[PDB]
Structures are given as C-alpha cells and as structure tokens.
C-alpha cells in the first residue's frame with residue numbers, strides 16, 4: 001500500500017553528469033560515449049552560429065568529477081551544444097533520445113556544477129512547461145525515463161520563465177513549447193489539467209482503498225469532454241480511454257464510470273475530504289506510472 | 300524558483316541492493332563492504348511469524364541456507380549474526396560500489412529518501428518523513444522488505460531506515476541499520492497499531508517559509524503569538540508541540556524572510572482556523588509537513 005510521487009532510480013544518469021564551463025558561465029553536461037551534450041547558451045539577441053565559430057575546443061572546460069576531459073570538437077544541434085571529448089564515458093548506460101508529449105511524466109536529476117543534488121518526478125504540462133525546482137546553475141540538468149535497462153533522455157533544462165516554471169529542450173535541442181533560449185519577454189500559455197492522468201490517479205486511489213468519490217453514474221465521452229473543457233481540463237480521447245483499460249479491468253470501474261466521478265468532483269469539489277492525502281486532483285501520474293507503482297516493476 | 304518533493308540521487312544506494320533468499324522468503328539486502336544487512340524475518344516462515352524465536356531459528360541455519368544475489372552474481376555467505384531486528388550476512392566479496400556511508404538513527408519529523416526495491420532491484424525513489432507516531436507513509440508492496448531510507452549529505456550516504464513491515468492501516472514500520480525499530484513495533488504478526496498521527500509543526504512552518512521565499516505571502520498576517528498560545532491552538536488540530544529547539548532551528552529562515560518564527564506561527568494558527576479558501580500554497584491545498592527546515596534551506600539555497 002501507499003502511493004508516492006516516485007522517480008526512476010537516477011544511478012544510470014548520475015554517471016553521465018559533468019560540469020561544463022565556458023568563460024564565466026558554468027552549467028551541466030550529459031556525457032554519453034565521447035560526446036558531452038549541454039545547452040548552447042553556455043557560449044553566451046544571440047547569434048549562436050556567430051558566437052560558436054569564435055570558440056575553440058580549449059575554451060570549453062569539461063569536468064567529470066575531479067578529472068578534466070579534453071574537448072576535441074564542437075558542433076551545435078538546434079539549442080544543444082555537442083562537445084566531442086577524447087574519452088568515452090565508461091559508465092554510459094544503454095540509452096535513447098526520446099521526445100515526449102504533454103502529459104507524459106519523467107524524472108529530473110537536478111544538478112549544480114556537474115554534481116547531482118536531487119531527483120524528482122514531474123510532468124510535461126499541456127503548455128509545454130515543467131513545474132520544476134531549479135536554481136541558477138541547474139541548466140543542463142536532464143529529465144529521463146527508464147524502460148527495462150534503457151535510459152530514455154527526454155529533457156534538458158535551459159531556463160526559468162517569469163512565473164517560476166521551467167522551459168527546456170529534448171536531447172536533440174528542440175524546445176518543448178513556443179520558447180527561445182534568450183533573455184526576452186516570454187510567457188507560458190494558460191495551463192490545463194492532464195485529464196487522463198487525473199483518471200489514472202483516481203484508479204490508484206481505488207487500488208489503495210479510497211472509494212468515497214465513486215458513484216453509480218456513467219457518462220458519454222462527448223458529455224465528459226464538454227464538462228472537462230469548461231474546467232480547463234484536456235480533452236479525453238478514445239486513446240486515453242483505451243490506455244486506462246487495464247486499470248478499468250483491475251478495479252472493475254469502467255473509464256466512463258470513473259469520468260462520472262471526475263465530473264462530480266469538478267462540479268462539487270472534495271467537500272473536506274481527500275484522495276490519497278491530497279485536497280487537489282493530481283495530474284502528474286500517467287496510467288503507466290500507476291500500473292508500474294501498484295505492480296512494482298524494477299530497473 | 301519552484302518547490303518540489305525532492306529525493307536524493309539514489310545511485311550510491313542502487314549499487315548496494317542485493318536479493319536475499321532463505322527458504323521460501325525472498326527480500327532485499329544492503330551490501331556494504333563484506334556485509335549484507337537485511338530484516339531478520341527473512342529466516343521466518345508465515346506459520347512461525349506470530350511468535351518467532353529468532354535466536355532459536357537462526358542457530359538452526361547455516362551459511363549455505365542464505366542465497367545472496369548481487370545482479371547476476373551469487374555471493375557466498377561465510378558468516379551470519381543478528382543485531383537486534385537486522386540480520387548481518389558476512390560475505391566473501393566486498394562490494395566494489397560501497398560508497399562513503401554512516402548508520403544514523405533519525406528522530407520523528409526527519410525526512411529521508413526511500414529506494415523501493417523488489418528482488419534486489421531498484422524500482423523507484425521517493426521522499427518521505429518519519430511520522431511523529433514512528434511510522435512512515437511509504438509506497439511498499441510485498442517483497443519490498445529490506446528497502447532502505449537514506450540521506451546523501453555531501454558525499455556520504457547516511458542510512459537511516461530499513462523497511463520491515465506494513466501495519467493494518469497501510470503505513471510502514473522499520474528499523475535503523477542497527478536493527479532497532481522506530482516506534483513501539485515488533486517484527487511479529489501480532490496485533491499492532493500505529494499511534495494517532497500528528498502534523499510535524501516545525502516542518503509546516505519551514506514549508507510556509509519556502510512559500511514566502513518563492514513569493515507566496517497571502518497567508519501572512521499582522522499578528523504574533525506566544526509559544527504557549529501557539530501550542531494550545533496547535534494541539535487542537537492534532538499538531539505536534541513546537542519546542543524552543545524548533546523555534547531556534549527556524550532562525551535562519553526567519554532571518555532570510557524577515558518574518559519572526561512566532562509571527563509565522565500566527566499565520567499557521569490562522570490557516571488552521573480558516574483553511575485555504577480555494578487557494579494553494581506551493582501548489583498544495585493542504586499544509587505540507589514532509590519538508591524539514593534543513594530541506595527548505597538546501598532546496599532554496601544549496
């Protein structure tokens with residue numbers, strides 16, 4: 001029993017964190033095989049092609065623990081700088097670069113000066129921001145998932161927006177959301193709640209003995225989406241209904257039946273009651289996270 | 300900016316997780332140097348669980364009865380001893396991945412990271428606190444026994460918890476790494492109930508300071524309180540008494556935000572009386588008590 005915001009074990013990612021210095025700027029890098037990936041703003045209205053051409057290999061000071069790595073090449077791919085090094089990381093795990101969709105969750109290994117300080121779980125918001133916990137020096141910290149023995153790198157931190165939310169790229173340097181890597185007026189779009197994730201978390205609560213919100217009613221997918229759109233909730237698709245199938249089978253509560261519970265929860269509130277120690281509806285657990293935690297999958 | 304329930308990077312602890320098998324029972328072990336630490340109930344059956352005599356059961360065991368597996372490698376047990384509720388299995392190989400470590404026994408209110416494991420394999424990491432009733436509100440299924448709680452301050456891993464059991468209410472009980480249980484719990488299937496839980500007052504105050512540091516001031520008020528009047532109010536909401544030690548510990552946060560501890564105490568009294576009124580504090584509609592004053596400083600400063 002118990003339901004916690006749980007991150008993947010960070011060990012495979014810790015062995016890849018390095019410190020990258022260029023001039024006055026010091027941030028984090030991801031060392032995989034003989035390449036160190038880091039945000040391109042480490043070289044900093046910036047013209048990154050112009051700024052990078054002026055740099056030489058010895059301008060980049062890469063430090064892996066108490067060992068200095070020597071940079072033998074540098075190239076830019078979108079908003080990520082790829083620093084070719086002489087040494088291949090012996091601790092390189094089996095990995096992939098994956099781009100995630102809004103609503104998907106991942107673990108963040110927050111780092112400062114190439115040293116991991118913490119690990120937390122979070123979700124890619126529908127407005128493409130992440131509600132992270134980042135201070136100055138965290139740039140280059142990465143988000144990941146583990147599937148079996150493979151580390152899927154899905155995020156690299158670049159910046160904090162004026163509202164305290166974070167913006168970053170995939171490992172190919174493509175930003176999530178309509179952001180750019182420069183000091184300019186940028187604002188996160190109006191956020192929405194990840195509906196499929198709230199439903200998955202309602203199933204996790206049922207699996208844990210919390211049934212007070214359940215009701216005899218069901219709804220059509222159309223009537224649910226008309227209500228959900230009114231409360232700034234993401235539309236629930238048939239793909240989402242299909243993905244919730246295993247949880248629906250395990251608890252004996254049809255997806256549209258659980259939608260009627262959510263529909264009532266939105267129009268009436270919790271009324272002093274809590275679901276899994278929370279007075280708010282939680283949307284940072286996907287249907288897979290719930291299955292993985294309530295079944296105990298290992299890595 | 301931002302405030303998250305953050306766990307320590309689990310890497311240093313992952314390299315210590317092994318699977319321990321004795322008869323039908325399979326749980327987790329902590330492999331540090333040439334010793335594997337695991338709950339002593341690994342020697343028990345379910346029929347010898349109401350009133351097990353562990354000295355008697357252990358004397359009947361030999362080294363080859365304990366099957367220790369570190370990854371896809373079987374470790375050879377060369378000795379076994381019991382220290383309180385923990386079994387210490389001497390092995391013939393010292394763990395090459397043994398980090399700098401300490402065994403620390405924590406007090407209620409303290410937080411730590413849990414590396415939940417099944418069959419010696421890490422499945423997840425989460426942050427939690429030692430409840431004032433000495434239980435932990437973990438996320439554990441059968442097979443998680445032997446999973447450990449830790450803090451990684453600087454380069455040293457401080458092991459503070461080893462998971463032993465789940466109480467009938469879904470909460471968890473375990474020991475420090477010396478096998479001494481936290482709380483009045485025993486490693487027996489006898490009737491055991493967690494005492495009435497209470498809110499870790501010093502931690503709620505620290506989390507209110509974290510919210511101030513992050514620009515959230517709506518809950519602040521022009522009032523202050525005596526420590527005695529605060530505790531009389533706090534007790535009525537099932538809140539732990541705030542001591543002078545707690546007031547002293549909150550000193551740095553009080554200095555950083557310019558809000559006296561007894562001033563923040565008056566905010567908390569008001570929150571307890573009024574509720575949040577549809578508002579949130581650090582994205583939470585409830586008062587959070589699983590961040591210590593030390594966690595807040597570390598996350599907001601370093």
Ligand SMILES: O=C(Nc1cncc2ccccc12)[C@@H]1CNCc2ccc(Cl)cc21
Pocket residue numbers: 001340348439440441442443444463464465466471485486487488
């Ligand atoms: O509690 C225990 N294990 C678990 C531990 N954690 C989470 C579980 C979740 C679901 C089932 C088991 C779980 C064991 C087994 N049950 C009785 C018992 C009695 C005493 C002792 Cl010390 C251990 C145990």
Ligand SMILES: [Cl-]
Pocket residue numbers: 404405406407409
């Ligand atoms: Cl302590």
